[PDB]
Design a protein around this ligand. Structure first.
Ligand SMILES: CCCCCCCC/C=C\CCCCCCCC(=O)OC[C@@H](O)CO
Ligand SMILES: CCCCCCCC/C=C\CCCCCCCC(=O)OC[C@@H](O)CO
Ligand SMILES: CCCCCCCC/C=C\CCCCCCCC(=O)OC[C@@H](O)CO
Ligand SMILES: CCCCCCCC/C=C\CCCCCCCC(=O)OC[C@H](O)CO
Ligand SMILES: CCCCCCCC/C=C\CCCCCCCC(=O)OC[C@H](O)CO
Ligand SMILES: CCCCCCCC/C=C\CCCCCCCC(=O)OC[C@H](O)CO
Ligand SMILES: CCCCCCCC/C=C\CCCCCCCC(=O)OC[C@H](O)CO
Ligand SMILES: CCCCCCCC/C=C\CCCCCCCC(=O)OC[C@H](O)CO
Ligand SMILES: CCCCCCCC/C=C\CCCCCCCC(=O)OC[C@H](O)CO
Ligand SMILES: *C/C=C(C)/C=C/C=C(C)/C=C/C1=C(C)CCCC1(C)C
Ligand SMILES: *C/C=C(C)/C=C/C=C(C)/C=C/C1=C(C)CCCC1(C)C
Ligand SMILES: *C/C=C(C)/C=C/C=C(C)/C=C/C1=C(C)CCCC1(C)C
Lengths: 228, 228, 228
């Protein structure tokens, strides 16, 4: 249900995340390697958070209307940003730990990533049209260089790891590059920006992206000898 | 004194936390070993935070009305969640340091704890009746993990410590086990859930639990020779 | 431009922060020593955050009305507190890293700093007049501790460092001591407190303080031989 029938995607996202979280738990039962276990904890928590936020959005909790100075009324599922505020740093930690990056470097990218999500939230909530696009631009600039440092910095951290770890890192990095880069596009073309698609199309697109960025990513990470 | 007299518990809550804080400050005046001091810092901050939360609640800040879809109007003190979001990980850090658990395992427990509290916040704030109980169930499920992992994982980390540390950990763990487990019962029987009792009684329940879970917990910890 | 023309300071503050972060970036293009690089990252993020917050206030997001219990209405720029909740701990990390303070010492100061900002936010948002001043007092007391522990505990940690590190620390410490201590005065005299001045003058004062506490501080830190 929802405002425009977009609830079907909120329900399926809820289910997709829960099934991924559950697979990950059953797959991690017979691991007691402390470092391997850490990868399971992180990678289970991520779709747990998302499942919870997707369910709250299904029930209408993360949903607010914003009347823009435009007169337009935007149906904002703000609970997304609550989800992303924690899971995108957890995702960055996950791949940082695989790459063997330093704590300096991981914290640097999480700080960058947080700035990306919070300026995206301001873009999403502010009523001043120019500010919405001003902050979407601010946020997209931070994403571009987050992705650059992810490639340049974590890439060089892993450059001295074994070949299985570098290859798992390359796959995970690639999932992030293609999948995360589309989020600002969905915001732009969905109802919070140019409104090229409705709340239904926009919610479907974030569902596909979230499921790939979390369950797809987690599956590839947890199935890789690199973490053993 | 509040909406339905509960101000008395908020006031006495304030005073007990503040007195607990002041005691802990007084008792750690000439502590200089870094590790012992760490315990004092954590264990002083915990009632500092709760005291501030109770005071804000006493004054009516952090009180909200929530109109449920069934027409019931619930007087929700949401400031508790602000408190718990920070004191419950600090409590977990406090006993994890005692147990000598890895920062992996404390972060793991802190992650489940945060999930517990925020899903509790959603259950308390959402208007949809079924969603309230849905998120109460996800949060209680997370609390069962947390406690299992508290007992299982911190217990094994404290198994190689001296005997005063093991016994101090056992005491503290039992305080968490008993008192923490009653919070979901409190929510369920109080005005946010089945309304078996009213906000006055529900507030009394939480005050008692907070004071045990923080001042009494902190008393047992700081008084122990295991912290030297 | 804003409520009372104070928007001029929000724009100049925006541009001032932006230009400080651009200077810092330009300054650190060829830094590759990790410790040196960490100082740059933190000290770039700080004005980046202040710039985004100032911009959002300029566009009126994070502006809100708070109507007190006595009928007075306060134009509350609450986005300040979102800015301060993150940049004041980063500033503490910066100088605590400079001072070679332990992670225990830094976390302690950051915990006190976080309490200072949140009780400041309560003071600013609460409607009960007595409460605003009670939480301003609470917040200011925490600041006195913070500044004291900064002087004592970071000063003690830097006491073993070389001549340029101590000297750089002293200058940074003194910037913190004089500039930070003026914020509660600004709150007290501005529209949040006694309203001796209005939002215009209040916003000018916070602008000057932020720029000195962030760009000025950043300049002194990043130009110092100590971080080499
Ligand atoms: C009105 C909204 C304005 C924007 C608010 C944005 C707030 C979020 C921004 C940043 C929060 C994340 C801070 C992240 C802080 C990272 C600091 C760091 O790099 O430390 C390295 C050391 O730990 C190594 O030992
Ligand atoms: C009735 C008022 C209730 C709220 C105020 C009471 C709670 C806060 C009291 C004072 C504000 C400062 C809190 C500061 C809490 C941080 C812990 C600390 O400073 O420890 C430093 C040393 O003592 C360690 O040995
Ligand atoms: C005009 C108001 C908005 C001002 C900010 C807009 C653009 C902010 C840009 C980035 C914000 C993210 C936090 C900045 C985080 C920088 C981390 C870093 O490693 O920096 C390296 C660079 O100096 C390149 O070598
Ligand atoms: C913005 C709020 C985010 C909330 C969501 C949590 C995000 C936590 C992720 C990284 C924290 C940085 C510390 C991560 C610790 C990883 C351990 C590690 O990286 O170990 C190698 C290092 O050399 C050992 O010091
Ligand atoms: C709403 C109120 C929020 C309040 C903020 C909540 C989050 C606190 C964050 C970090 C503190 C971590 C605990 C400190 C760990 C190190 C303590 C320490 O060891 O301090 C030793 C020093 O010598 C003497 O202070
Ligand atoms: C993200 C949801 C909000 C969470 C808000 C938390 C506020 C700070 C309180 C506890 C964090 C403790 C630090 C994280 C875990 C590290 C534990 C640690 O410091 O371990 C030290 C030990 O010496 C290693 O051997
Ligand atoms: C939309 C409203 C509903 C949203 C509900 C969810 C909100 C966030 C829940 C929990 C935060 C998780 C914070 C995780 C902090 C880091 C934990 C961690 O890093 O754990 C692994 C460790 O590194 C090695 O074992
Ligand atoms: C009012 C009741 C509300 C519901 C709350 C119910 C209690 C919480 C549930 C599970 C935690 C207890 C887990 C017990 C099993 C852990 C012990 C164990 O199996 O292993 C111990 C380990 O070996 C030692 O180091
Ligand atoms: C309600 C708010 C709750 C509190 C929110 C605070 C947010 C702080 C954000 C960034 C600063 C993170 C500072 C982390 C400091 C860790 C200590 C450390 O890194 O120590 C290094 C060690 O000494 C080797 O040099
Ligand atoms: C699990 C969730 C993930 C991986 C979400 C990532 C989200 C983003 C990369 C969002 C980016 C955005 C911007 C860069 C522009 C402003 C709009 C956002 C927040 C959608
Ligand atoms: C100092 C405060 C403490 C120790 C509070 C801990 C609180 C909880 C364990 C609360 C848990 C809850 C549930 C498990 C179900 C959802 C309702 C809550 C948030 C009360
Ligand atoms: C870069 C931002 C800085 C340096 C902000 C500093 C802010 C403070 C030191 C805040 C002080 C306050 C109190 C101590 C009293 C209550 C009002 C506050 C929050 C302004």
């Amino acid at each position: 249900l929802g405002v425009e029938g977009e609830g079907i995607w909120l329900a399926l996202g809820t289910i997709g995340m829960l099934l991924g979280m559950l697979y990950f738990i059953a797959d991690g039962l017979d691991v007691q390697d402390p470092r391997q276990k850490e990868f399971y904890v992180i990678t289970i928590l991520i779709p747990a958070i998302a499942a919870a936020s997707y369910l709250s959005m299904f029930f209408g909790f993360g949903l607010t209307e914003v009347s823009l100075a435009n007169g337009r009324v935007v149906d904002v599922y703000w609970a997304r940003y609550a989800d992303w505020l924690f899971t995108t740093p957890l995702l960055l930690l996950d791949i940082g730990l695989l790459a063997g990056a330093s704590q300096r470097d991981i914290g640097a990218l999480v700080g960058i990533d947080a700035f990306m999500i919070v300026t995206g939230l301001v873009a999403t909530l502010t009523k001043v049209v120019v500010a919405r696009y001003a902050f979407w631009t601010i946020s997209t600039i931070s994403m571009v260089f987050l992705l650059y440092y992810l490639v340049a910095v974590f890439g060089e951290a892993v450059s001295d790891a074994d070949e299985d770890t570098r290859s798992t890192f390359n796959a995970l990095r690639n999932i992030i590059l293609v999948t995360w880069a589309i989020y600002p596009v969905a915001w732009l073309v969905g109802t919070e920006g140019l409104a090229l698609t409705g709340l239904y199309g926009e919610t479907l697109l974030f569902m596909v992206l979230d499921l790939v960025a979390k369950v797809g990513f987690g599956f590839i990470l947890l199935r890789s000898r690199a973490i053993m």
